[PDB]
Amino acid sequence: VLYVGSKTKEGVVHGVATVAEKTKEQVTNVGGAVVTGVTAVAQKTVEGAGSIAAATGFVKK
Amino acid sequence: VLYVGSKTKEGVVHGVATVAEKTKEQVTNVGGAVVTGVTAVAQKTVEGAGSIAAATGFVKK
Amino acid sequence: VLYVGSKTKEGVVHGVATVAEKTKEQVTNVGGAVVTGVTAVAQKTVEGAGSIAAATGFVKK
Amino acid sequence: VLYVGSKTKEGVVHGVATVAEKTKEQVTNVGGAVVTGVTAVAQKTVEGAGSIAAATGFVKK
Amino acid sequence: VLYVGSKTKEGVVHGVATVAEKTKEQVTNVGGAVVTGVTAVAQKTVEGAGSIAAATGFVKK
Amino acid sequence: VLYVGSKTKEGVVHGVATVAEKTKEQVTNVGGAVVTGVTAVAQKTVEGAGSIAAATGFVKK
């Protein structure tokens, strides 16, 4: 009946420092799904299904 | 009946520093899905399904 | 009945510094989907399905 | 008698990413020396004295 | 008599990522020396005295 | 008589990631020397005295 919110964080990323020194980097995909290199991601879903790094091979019927 | 929000963060990214030194980088895809290199992403979905880095192979019926 | 919002962030990215030194970078796609190099993206969807980096192979019926 | 140099780095800075979120920042000096906020500096001195961030109070004789 | 150098690094900084979230930051100096916040600095001195972050109070004679 | 150098690093810093979350930070100096916050520094001195973070109170004669 009364919701008093204040400074309330939800699905939040802050203060990230990364270093990635790589001399070679390959990704070879054939007919599938590949998710690589996600970093510092945030979301908030209301009344729905949410996925950050979701991979699936194939959906058949 | 009364919602008093204040400084309320939702799905927020802030304060990211990245360095990526790579000498070679390849991605070879054949008939699929490849998601690579996502960084510092944010979203907020109301009454819907939300996905940040979603890969799928194929949807058949 | 009364919504008093203030300084409320939603789906927000701020304060990002990136450096990407790469000597070679290739992407070879054949009949699929490839999403690469997303950085500092934000969105907010009301009553709809939202996707940031979504890849799909093919939708058949 | 023969100096063959190649790709020889000396006094070199490369590939720096910084983020500095500060809400207040003061510096109060009275009759002295204050050096603040040096970042990504490089030099090379031949036959001479070199200093990057040197502070001194006073030189009297 | 013959110096063959190759890819020889000297006084080199590379690949640094820093994040500094500070809400307040003060420096109060009175008649002295203050060196603050040096980051990612490089130098090379030949036949001379070199100093990176050197502070001194006062030199009297 | 023959110096064959190759990929020889000297005084080198590489691959540093730091995060510094501080809510308050003060430095109060009176007639002295204060060195604070050095990070990722490199140097190489030939035939001379070198100092990275050197503090001294005062030199009198």
Side-chain angles (χ1 to χ4, degrees):
Chain A
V1 179
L2 308 80
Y3 182 105
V4 175
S6 173
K7 306 199 174 185
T8 39
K9 297 201 169 207
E10 283 181 338
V12 164
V13 170
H14 73 87
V16 182
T18 64
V19 171
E21 308 202 315
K22 301 171 186 184
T23 310
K24 187 183 283 186
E25 175 170 353
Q26 320 178 351
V27 172
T28 305
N29 177 22
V30 169
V34 171
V35 181
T36 188
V38 171
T39 188
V41 168
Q43 70 161 334
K44 150 145 195 185
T45 316
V46 162
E47 197 158 12
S51 302
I52 293 282
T56 316
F58 50 82
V59 177
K60 283 188 177 176
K61 305 188 189 329
Chain B
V1 179
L2 308 80
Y3 182 105
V4 175
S6 173
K7 306 199 174 185
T8 39
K9 297 201 169 207
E10 283 181 338
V12 164
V13 170
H14 73 87
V16 182
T18 64
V19 171
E21 308 202 315
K22 301 171 186 184
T23 310
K24 187 183 283 186
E25 175 170 353
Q26 320 178 351
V27 172
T28 305
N29 177 22
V30 169
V34 171
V35 181
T36 188
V38 171
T39 188
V41 168
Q43 70 161 334
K44 150 145 195 185
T45 316
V46 162
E47 197 158 12
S51 302
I52 292 282
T56 316
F58 50 82
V59 177
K60 282 188 177 176
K61 305 188 189 329
Chain C
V1 179
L2 308 80
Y3 182 105
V4 175
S6 173
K7 306 199 174 185
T8 39
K9 297 201 169 207
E10 283 181 338
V12 164
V13 170
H14 73 87
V16 182
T18 64
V19 171
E21 308 202 315
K22 301 171 185 184
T23 310
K24 187 183 283 186
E25 175 170 353
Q26 320 178 351
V27 172
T28 305
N29 177 22
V30 169
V34 171
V35 181
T36 188
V38 171
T39 188
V41 168
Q43 70 161 334
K44 150 145 195 185
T45 316
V46 162
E47 197 158 12
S51 302
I52 293 282
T56 316
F58 50 82
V59 177
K60 282 188 177 176
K61 305 188 189 329
Chain D
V1 179
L2 308 80
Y3 182 105
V4 175
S6 173
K7 306 199 174 185
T8 39
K9 297 201 169 207
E10 283 181 338
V12 164
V13 170
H14 73 86
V16 182
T18 64
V19 171
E21 308 202 315
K22 301 171 186 184
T23 310
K24 187 183 283 186
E25 175 170 353
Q26 320 178 351
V27 172
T28 305
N29 177 22
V30 169
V34 171
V35 181
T36 188
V38 171
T39 188
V41 168
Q43 70 161 334
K44 150 145 195 185
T45 316
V46 162
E47 197 158 12
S51 302
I52 293 282
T56 316
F58 50 82
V59 177
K60 282 188 177 176
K61 305 188 189 329
Chain E
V1 179
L2 308 80
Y3 182 105
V4 175
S6 173
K7 306 199 174 185
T8 39
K9 297 201 169 207
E10 283 181 338
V12 164
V13 170
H14 73 87
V16 182
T18 64
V19 171
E21 308 202 315
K22 301 171 186 184
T23 310
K24 187 183 283 186
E25 175 170 353
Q26 320 178 351
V27 172
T28 305
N29 177 22
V30 169
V34 170
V35 181
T36 188
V38 171
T39 188
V41 168
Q43 70 161 334
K44 150 145 195 185
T45 316
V46 162
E47 197 158 12
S51 302
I52 293 282
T56 316
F58 50 82
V59 177
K60 282 188 177 176
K61 305 188 189 329
Chain F
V1 179
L2 308 80
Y3 182 105
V4 175
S6 173
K7 306 199 174 185
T8 39
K9 297 201 169 207
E10 283 181 338
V12 164
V13 170
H14 73 86
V16 182
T18 64
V19 171
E21 308 202 315
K22 301 171 185 184
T23 310
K24 187 183 283 186
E25 175 170 353
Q26 320 178 351
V27 172
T28 305
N29 177 22
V30 169
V34 171
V35 181
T36 188
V38 171
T39 188
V41 168
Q43 70 161 334
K44 150 145 195 185
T45 316
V46 162
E47 197 158 12
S51 302
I52 292 282
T56 316
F58 50 82
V59 177
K60 282 188 177 176
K61 305 188 189 329

mmCIF file with all atom_site columns, all heavy atoms in Angstrom, chain B residues 21-43:
data_model
loop_
_atom_site.group_PDB
_atom_site.id
_atom_site.type_symbol
_atom_site.label_atom_id
_atom_site.label_alt_id
_atom_site.label_comp_id
_atom_site.label_asym_id
_atom_site.label_entity_id
_atom_site.label_seq_id
_atom_site.pdbx_PDB_ins_code
_atom_site.Cartn_x
_atom_site.Cartn_y
_atom_site.Cartn_z
_atom_site.occupancy
_atom_site.B_iso_or_equiv
_atom_site.pdbx_formal_charge
_atom_site.auth_seq_id
_atom_site.auth_comp_id
_atom_site.auth_asym_id
_atom_site.auth_atom_id
_atom_site.pdbx_PDB_model_num
ATOM 1   N N   . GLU B 1 21 ? 44.624 -6.867  -25.047 1.00 0.00 ? 21 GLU B N   1
ATOM 2   C CA  . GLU B 1 21 ? 45.697 -6.960  -26.023 1.00 0.00 ? 21 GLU B CA  1
ATOM 3   C C   . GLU B 1 21 ? 45.721 -8.363  -26.611 1.00 0.00 ? 21 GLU B C   1
ATOM 4   O O   . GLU B 1 21 ? 46.120 -9.311  -25.933 1.00 0.00 ? 21 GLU B O   1
ATOM 5   C CB  . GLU B 1 21 ? 47.039 -6.640  -25.380 1.00 0.00 ? 21 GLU B CB  1
ATOM 6   C CG  . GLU B 1 21 ? 47.059 -5.341  -24.624 1.00 0.00 ? 21 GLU B CG  1
ATOM 7   C CD  . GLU B 1 21 ? 48.452 -4.776  -24.454 1.00 0.00 ? 21 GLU B CD  1
ATOM 8   O OE1 . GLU B 1 21 ? 49.380 -5.535  -24.112 1.00 0.00 ? 21 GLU B OE1 1
ATOM 9   O OE2 . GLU B 1 21 ? 48.619 -3.563  -24.675 1.00 0.00 ? 21 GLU B OE2 1
ATOM 10  N N   . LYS B 1 22 ? 45.312 -8.497  -27.870 1.00 0.00 ? 22 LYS B N   1
ATOM 11  C CA  . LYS B 1 22 ? 45.311 -9.787  -28.536 1.00 0.00 ? 22 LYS B CA  1
ATOM 12  C C   . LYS B 1 22 ? 46.018 -9.670  -29.871 1.00 0.00 ? 22 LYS B C   1
ATOM 13  O O   . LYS B 1 22 ? 45.764 -8.749  -30.639 1.00 0.00 ? 22 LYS B O   1
ATOM 14  C CB  . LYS B 1 22 ? 43.894 -10.304 -28.726 1.00 0.00 ? 22 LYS B CB  1
ATOM 15  C CG  . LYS B 1 22 ? 43.190 -10.449 -27.420 1.00 0.00 ? 22 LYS B CG  1
ATOM 16  C CD  . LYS B 1 22 ? 41.731 -10.737 -27.566 1.00 0.00 ? 22 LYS B CD  1
ATOM 17  C CE  . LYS B 1 22 ? 41.089 -10.729 -26.197 1.00 0.00 ? 22 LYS B CE  1
ATOM 18  N NZ  . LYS B 1 22 ? 39.664 -11.106 -26.244 1.00 0.00 ? 22 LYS B NZ  1
ATOM 19  N N   . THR B 1 23 ? 46.904 -10.614 -30.151 1.00 0.00 ? 23 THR B N   1
ATOM 20  C CA  . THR B 1 23 ? 47.662 -10.554 -31.390 1.00 0.00 ? 23 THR B CA  1
ATOM 21  C C   . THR B 1 23 ? 46.912 -11.144 -32.582 1.00 0.00 ? 23 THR B C   1
ATOM 22  O O   . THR B 1 23 ? 47.083 -10.664 -33.705 1.00 0.00 ? 23 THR B O   1
ATOM 23  C CB  . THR B 1 23 ? 49.005 -11.253 -31.206 1.00 0.00 ? 23 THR B CB  1
ATOM 24  O OG1 . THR B 1 23 ? 49.627 -10.742 -30.028 1.00 0.00 ? 23 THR B OG1 1
ATOM 25  C CG2 . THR B 1 23 ? 49.908 -10.987 -32.376 1.00 0.00 ? 23 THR B CG2 1
ATOM 26  N N   . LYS B 1 24 ? 46.088 -12.167 -32.380 1.00 0.00 ? 24 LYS B N   1
ATOM 27  C CA  . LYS B 1 24 ? 45.196 -12.643 -33.421 1.00 0.00 ? 24 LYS B CA  1
ATOM 28  C C   . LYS B 1 24 ? 43.900 -13.093 -32.777 1.00 0.00 ? 24 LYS B C   1
ATOM 29  O O   . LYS B 1 24 ? 43.885 -13.505 -31.621 1.00 0.00 ? 24 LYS B O   1
ATOM 30  C CB  . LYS B 1 24 ? 45.817 -13.775 -34.223 1.00 0.00 ? 24 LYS B CB  1
ATOM 31  C CG  . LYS B 1 24 ? 44.992 -14.181 -35.420 1.00 0.00 ? 24 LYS B CG  1
ATOM 32  C CD  . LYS B 1 24 ? 45.596 -15.356 -36.160 1.00 0.00 ? 24 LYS B CD  1
ATOM 33  C CE  . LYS B 1 24 ? 46.781 -14.948 -37.009 1.00 0.00 ? 24 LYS B CE  1
ATOM 34  N NZ  . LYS B 1 24 ? 47.277 -16.085 -37.833 1.00 0.00 ? 24 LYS B NZ  1
ATOM 35  N N   . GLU B 1 25 ? 42.805 -13.000 -33.524 1.00 0.00 ? 25 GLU B N   1
ATOM 36  C CA  . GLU B 1 25 ? 41.491 -13.349 -32.990 1.00 0.00 ? 25 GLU B CA  1
ATOM 37  C C   . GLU B 1 25 ? 40.577 -13.708 -34.157 1.00 0.00 ? 25 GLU B C   1
ATOM 38  O O   . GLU B 1 25 ? 40.290 -12.855 -34.996 1.00 0.00 ? 25 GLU B O   1
ATOM 39  C CB  . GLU B 1 25 ? 40.921 -12.205 -32.171 1.00 0.00 ? 25 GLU B CB  1
ATOM 40  C CG  . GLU B 1 25 ? 39.519 -12.444 -31.696 1.00 0.00 ? 25 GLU B CG  1
ATOM 41  C CD  . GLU B 1 25 ? 39.079 -11.402 -30.705 1.00 0.00 ? 25 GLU B CD  1
ATOM 42  O OE1 . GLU B 1 25 ? 39.931 -10.591 -30.306 1.00 0.00 ? 25 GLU B OE1 1
ATOM 43  O OE2 . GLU B 1 25 ? 37.891 -11.389 -30.326 1.00 0.00 ? 25 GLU B OE2 1
ATOM 44  N N   . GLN B 1 26 ? 40.127 -14.959 -34.204 1.00 0.00 ? 26 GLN B N   1
ATOM 45  C CA  . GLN B 1 26 ? 39.278 -15.453 -35.274 1.00 0.00 ? 26 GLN B CA  1
ATOM 46  C C   . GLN B 1 26 ? 37.988 -16.030 -34.720 1.00 0.00 ? 26 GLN B C   1
ATOM 47  O O   . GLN B 1 26 ? 37.934 -16.481 -33.579 1.00 0.00 ? 26 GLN B O   1
ATOM 48  C CB  . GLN B 1 26 ? 39.995 -16.516 -36.088 1.00 0.00 ? 26 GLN B CB  1
ATOM 49  C CG  . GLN B 1 26 ? 41.436 -16.194 -36.321 1.00 0.00 ? 26 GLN B CG  1
ATOM 50  C CD  . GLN B 1 26 ? 42.146 -17.267 -37.088 1.00 0.00 ? 26 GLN B CD  1
ATOM 51  O OE1 . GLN B 1 26 ? 41.602 -18.342 -37.314 1.00 0.00 ? 26 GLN B OE1 1
ATOM 52  N NE2 . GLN B 1 26 ? 43.366 -16.985 -37.506 1.00 0.00 ? 26 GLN B NE2 1
ATOM 53  N N   . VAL B 1 27 ? 36.943 -15.995 -35.540 1.00 0.00 ? 27 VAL B N   1
ATOM 54  C CA  . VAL B 1 27 ? 35.659 -16.619 -35.240 1.00 0.00 ? 27 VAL B CA  1
ATOM 55  C C   . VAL B 1 27 ? 35.142 -17.210 -36.537 1.00 0.00 ? 27 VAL B C   1
ATOM 56  O O   . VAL B 1 27 ? 34.921 -16.476 -37.503 1.00 0.00 ? 27 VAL B O   1
ATOM 57  C CB  . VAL B 1 27 ? 34.625 -15.634 -34.677 1.00 0.00 ? 27 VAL B CB  1
ATOM 58  C CG1 . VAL B 1 27 ? 33.291 -16.310 -34.573 1.00 0.00 ? 27 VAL B CG1 1
ATOM 59  C CG2 . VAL B 1 27 ? 35.039 -15.125 -33.333 1.00 0.00 ? 27 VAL B CG2 1
ATOM 60  N N   . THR B 1 28 ? 34.949 -18.523 -36.569 1.00 0.00 ? 28 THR B N   1
ATOM 61  C CA  . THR B 1 28 ? 34.490 -19.219 -37.766 1.00 0.00 ? 28 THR B CA  1
ATOM 62  C C   . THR B 1 28 ? 33.171 -19.894 -37.443 1.00 0.00 ? 28 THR B C   1
ATOM 63  O O   . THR B 1 28 ? 33.132 -20.827 -36.641 1.00 0.00 ? 28 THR B O   1
ATOM 64  C CB  . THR B 1 28 ? 35.510 -20.242 -38.243 1.00 0.00 ? 28 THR B CB  1
ATOM 65  O OG1 . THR B 1 28 ? 36.777 -19.608 -38.446 1.00 0.00 ? 28 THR B OG1 1
ATOM 66  C CG2 . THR B 1 28 ? 35.057 -20.836 -39.536 1.00 0.00 ? 28 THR B CG2 1
ATOM 67  N N   . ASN B 1 29 ? 32.096 -19.431 -38.058 1.00 0.00 ? 29 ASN B N   1
ATOM 68  C CA  . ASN B 1 29 ? 30.774 -19.972 -37.814 1.00 0.00 ? 29 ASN B CA  1
ATOM 69  C C   . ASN B 1 29 ? 30.249 -20.602 -39.086 1.00 0.00 ? 29 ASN B C   1
ATOM 70  O O   . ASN B 1 29 ? 30.524 -20.114 -40.183 1.00 0.00 ? 29 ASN B O   1
ATOM 71  C CB  . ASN B 1 29 ? 29.809 -18.895 -37.350 1.00 0.00 ? 29 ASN B CB  1
ATOM 72  C CG  . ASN B 1 29 ? 28.424 -19.417 -37.161 1.00 0.00 ? 29 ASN B CG  1
ATOM 73  O OD1 . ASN B 1 29 ? 28.225 -20.606 -36.977 1.00 0.00 ? 29 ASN B OD1 1
ATOM 74  N ND2 . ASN B 1 29 ? 27.452 -18.535 -37.203 1.00 0.00 ? 29 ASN B ND2 1
ATOM 75  N N   . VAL B 1 30 ? 29.510 -21.697 -38.935 1.00 0.00 ? 30 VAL B N   1
ATOM 76  C CA  . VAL B 1 30 ? 28.881 -22.395 -40.053 1.00 0.00 ? 30 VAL B CA  1
ATOM 77  C C   . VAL B 1 30 ? 27.487 -22.787 -39.580 1.00 0.00 ? 30 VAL B C   1
ATOM 78  O O   . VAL B 1 30 ? 27.328 -23.691 -38.762 1.00 0.00 ? 30 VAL B O   1
ATOM 79  C CB  . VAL B 1 30 ? 29.672 -23.620 -40.508 1.00 0.00 ? 30 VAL B CB  1
ATOM 80  C CG1 . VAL B 1 30 ? 28.847 -24.422 -41.457 1.00 0.00 ? 30 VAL B CG1 1
ATOM 81  C CG2 . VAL B 1 30 ? 30.970 -23.214 -41.171 1.00 0.00 ? 30 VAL B CG2 1
ATOM 82  N N   . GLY B 1 31 ? 26.476 -22.079 -40.060 1.00 0.00 ? 31 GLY B N   1
ATOM 83  C CA  . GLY B 1 31 ? 25.099 -22.470 -39.834 1.00 0.00 ? 31 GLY B CA  1
ATOM 84  C C   . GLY B 1 31 ? 24.616 -22.473 -38.400 1.00 0.00 ? 31 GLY B C   1
ATOM 85  O O   . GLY B 1 31 ? 23.664 -23.192 -38.083 1.00 0.00 ? 31 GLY B O   1
ATOM 86  N N   . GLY B 1 32 ? 25.224 -21.682 -37.523 1.00 0.00 ? 32 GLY B N   1
ATOM 87  C CA  . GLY B 1 32 ? 24.821 -21.711 -36.132 1.00 0.00 ? 32 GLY B CA  1
ATOM 88  C C   . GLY B 1 32 ? 24.551 -20.351 -35.526 1.00 0.00 ? 32 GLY B C   1
ATOM 89  O O   . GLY B 1 32 ? 23.804 -19.553 -36.093 1.00 0.00 ? 32 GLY B O   1
ATOM 90  N N   . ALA B 1 33 ? 25.139 -20.092 -34.360 1.00 0.00 ? 33 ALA B N   1
ATOM 91  C CA  . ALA B 1 33 ? 25.081 -18.795 -33.713 1.00 0.00 ? 33 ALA B CA  1
ATOM 92  C C   . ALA B 1 33 ? 26.319 -18.628 -32.853 1.00 0.00 ? 33 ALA B C   1
ATOM 93  O O   . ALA B 1 33 ? 26.712 -19.549 -32.142 1.00 0.00 ? 33 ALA B O   1
ATOM 94  C CB  . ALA B 1 33 ? 23.831 -18.655 -32.864 1.00 0.00 ? 33 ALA B CB  1
ATOM 95  N N   . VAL B 1 34 ? 26.938 -17.452 -32.926 1.00 0.00 ? 34 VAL B N   1
ATOM 96  C CA  . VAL B 1 34 ? 28.125 -17.140 -32.132 1.00 0.00 ? 34 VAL B CA  1
ATOM 97  C C   . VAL B 1 34 ? 27.977 -15.731 -31.574 1.00 0.00 ? 34 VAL B C   1
ATOM 98  O O   . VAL B 1 34 ? 27.787 -14.779 -32.332 1.00 0.00 ? 34 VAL B O   1
ATOM 99  C CB  . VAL B 1 34 ? 29.420 -17.251 -32.948 1.00 0.00 ? 34 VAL B CB  1
ATOM 100 C CG1 . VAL B 1 34 ? 30.561 -16.703 -32.158 1.00 0.00 ? 34 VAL B CG1 1
ATOM 101 C CG2 . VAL B 1 34 ? 29.685 -18.679 -33.299 1.00 0.00 ? 34 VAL B CG2 1
ATOM 102 N N   . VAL B 1 35 ? 28.054 -15.600 -30.256 1.00 0.00 ? 35 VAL B N   1
ATOM 103 C CA  . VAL B 1 35 ? 28.017 -14.314 -29.579 1.00 0.00 ? 35 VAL B CA  1
ATOM 104 C C   . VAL B 1 35 ? 29.328 -14.147 -28.838 1.00 0.00 ? 35 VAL B C   1
ATOM 105 O O   . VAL B 1 35 ? 29.666 -14.967 -27.984 1.00 0.00 ? 35 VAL B O   1
ATOM 106 C CB  . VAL B 1 35 ? 26.834 -14.223 -28.611 1.00 0.00 ? 35 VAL B CB  1
ATOM 107 C CG1 . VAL B 1 35 ? 26.812 -12.890 -27.954 1.00 0.00 ? 35 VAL B CG1 1
ATOM 108 C CG2 . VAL B 1 35 ? 25.562 -14.458 -29.345 1.00 0.00 ? 35 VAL B CG2 1
ATOM 109 N N   . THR B 1 36 ? 30.063 -13.092 -29.157 1.00 0.00 ? 36 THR B N   1
ATOM 110 C CA  . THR B 1 36 ? 31.383 -12.893 -28.577 1.00 0.00 ? 36 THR B CA  1
ATOM 111 C C   . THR B 1 36 ? 31.612 -11.425 -28.254 1.00 0.00 ? 36 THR B C   1
ATOM 112 O O   . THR B 1 36 ? 31.135 -10.544 -28.970 1.00 0.00 ? 36 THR B O   1
ATOM 113 C CB  . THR B 1 36 ? 32.478 -13.424 -29.512 1.00 0.00 ? 36 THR B CB  1
ATOM 114 O OG1 . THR B 1 36 ? 33.744 -13.396 -28.847 1.00 0.00 ? 36 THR B OG1 1
ATOM 115 C CG2 . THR B 1 36 ? 32.563 -12.648 -30.782 1.00 0.00 ? 36 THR B CG2 1
ATOM 116 N N   . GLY B 1 37 ? 32.297 -11.172 -27.150 1.00 0.00 ? 37 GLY B N   1
ATOM 117 C CA  . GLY B 1 37 ? 32.768 -9.852  -26.821 1.00 0.00 ? 37 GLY B CA  1
ATOM 118 C C   . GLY B 1 37 ? 31.763 -8.894  -26.242 1.00 0.00 ? 37 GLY B C   1
ATOM 119 O O   . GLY B 1 37 ? 31.899 -7.690  -26.455 1.00 0.00 ? 37 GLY B O   1
ATOM 120 N N   . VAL B 1 38 ? 30.766 -9.372  -25.519 1.00 0.00 ? 38 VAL B N   1
ATOM 121 C CA  . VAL B 1 38 ? 29.837 -8.478  -24.843 1.00 0.00 ? 38 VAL B CA  1
ATOM 122 C C   . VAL B 1 38 ? 30.507 -7.937  -23.588 1.00 0.00 ? 38 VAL B C   1
ATOM 123 O O   . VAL B 1 38 ? 31.188 -8.676  -22.872 1.00 0.00 ? 38 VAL B O   1
ATOM 124 C CB  . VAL B 1 38 ? 28.529 -9.206  -24.517 1.00 0.00 ? 38 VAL B CB  1
ATOM 125 C CG1 . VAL B 1 38 ? 27.671 -8.372  -23.633 1.00 0.00 ? 38 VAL B CG1 1
ATOM 126 C CG2 . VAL B 1 38 ? 27.797 -9.515  -25.778 1.00 0.00 ? 38 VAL B CG2 1
ATOM 127 N N   . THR B 1 39 ? 30.340 -6.641  -23.328 1.00 0.00 ? 39 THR B N   1
ATOM 128 C CA  . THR B 1 39 ? 30.950 -6.007  -22.166 1.00 0.00 ? 39 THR B CA  1
ATOM 129 C C   . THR B 1 39 ? 30.195 -4.738  -21.816 1.00 0.00 ? 39 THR B C   1
ATOM 130 O O   . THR B 1 39 ? 29.893 -3.931  -22.688 1.00 0.00 ? 39 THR B O   1
ATOM 131 C CB  . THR B 1 39 ? 32.444 -5.718  -22.400 1.00 0.00 ? 39 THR B CB  1
ATOM 132 O OG1 . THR B 1 39 ? 33.058 -5.276  -21.187 1.00 0.00 ? 39 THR B OG1 1
ATOM 133 C CG2 . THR B 1 39 ? 32.680 -4.719  -23.473 1.00 0.00 ? 39 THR B CG2 1
ATOM 134 N N   . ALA B 1 40 ? 29.873 -4.589  -20.536 1.00 0.00 ? 40 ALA B N   1
ATOM 135 C CA  . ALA B 1 40 ? 29.187 -3.409  -20.021 1.00 0.00 ? 40 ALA B CA  1
ATOM 136 C C   . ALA B 1 40 ? 27.839 -3.195  -20.709 1.00 0.00 ? 40 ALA B C   1
ATOM 137 O O   . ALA B 1 40 ? 27.634 -2.230  -21.431 1.00 0.00 ? 40 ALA B O   1
ATOM 138 C CB  . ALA B 1 40 ? 30.071 -2.173  -20.152 1.00 0.00 ? 40 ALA B CB  1
ATOM 139 N N   . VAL B 1 41 ? 26.915 -4.117  -20.469 1.00 0.00 ? 41 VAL B N   1
ATOM 140 C CA  . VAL B 1 41 ? 25.580 -4.068  -21.047 1.00 0.00 ? 41 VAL B CA  1
ATOM 141 C C   . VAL B 1 41 ? 24.577 -4.062  -19.911 1.00 0.00 ? 41 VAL B C   1
ATOM 142 O O   . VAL B 1 41 ? 24.823 -4.667  -18.868 1.00 0.00 ? 41 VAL B O   1
ATOM 143 C CB  . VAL B 1 41 ? 25.344 -5.258  -21.986 1.00 0.00 ? 41 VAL B CB  1
ATOM 144 C CG1 . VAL B 1 41 ? 23.903 -5.368  -22.355 1.00 0.00 ? 41 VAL B CG1 1
ATOM 145 C CG2 . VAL B 1 41 ? 26.174 -5.106  -23.217 1.00 0.00 ? 41 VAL B CG2 1
ATOM 146 N N   . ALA B 1 42 ? 23.457 -3.374  -20.098 1.00 0.00 ? 42 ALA B N   1
ATOM 147 C CA  . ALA B 1 42 ? 22.423 -3.312  -19.075 1.00 0.00 ? 42 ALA B CA  1
ATOM 148 C C   . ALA B 1 42 ? 21.053 -3.172  -19.718 1.00 0.00 ? 42 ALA B C   1
ATOM 149 O O   . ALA B 1 42 ? 20.914 -2.501  -20.738 1.00 0.00 ? 42 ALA B O   1
ATOM 150 C CB  . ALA B 1 42 ? 22.664 -2.144  -18.125 1.00 0.00 ? 42 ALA B CB  1
ATOM 151 N N   . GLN B 1 43 ? 20.041 -3.802  -19.126 1.00 0.00 ? 43 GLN B N   1
ATOM 152 C CA  . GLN B 1 43 ? 18.682 -3.589  -19.582 1.00 0.00 ? 43 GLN B CA  1
ATOM 153 C C   . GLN B 1 43 ? 17.701 -3.958  -18.499 1.00 0.00 ? 43 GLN B C   1
ATOM 154 O O   . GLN B 1 43 ? 18.038 -4.628  -17.534 1.00 0.00 ? 43 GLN B O   1
ATOM 155 C CB  . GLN B 1 43 ? 18.351 -4.395  -20.815 1.00 0.00 ? 43 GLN B CB  1
ATOM 156 C CG  . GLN B 1 43 ? 18.245 -5.847  -20.573 1.00 0.00 ? 43 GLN B CG  1
ATOM 157 C CD  . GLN B 1 43 ? 17.498 -6.528  -21.674 1.00 0.00 ? 43 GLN B CD  1
ATOM 158 O OE1 . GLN B 1 43 ? 16.678 -5.916  -22.346 1.00 0.00 ? 43 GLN B OE1 1
ATOM 159 N NE2 . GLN B 1 43 ? 17.806 -7.790  -21.899 1.00 0.00 ? 43 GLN B NE2 1
#
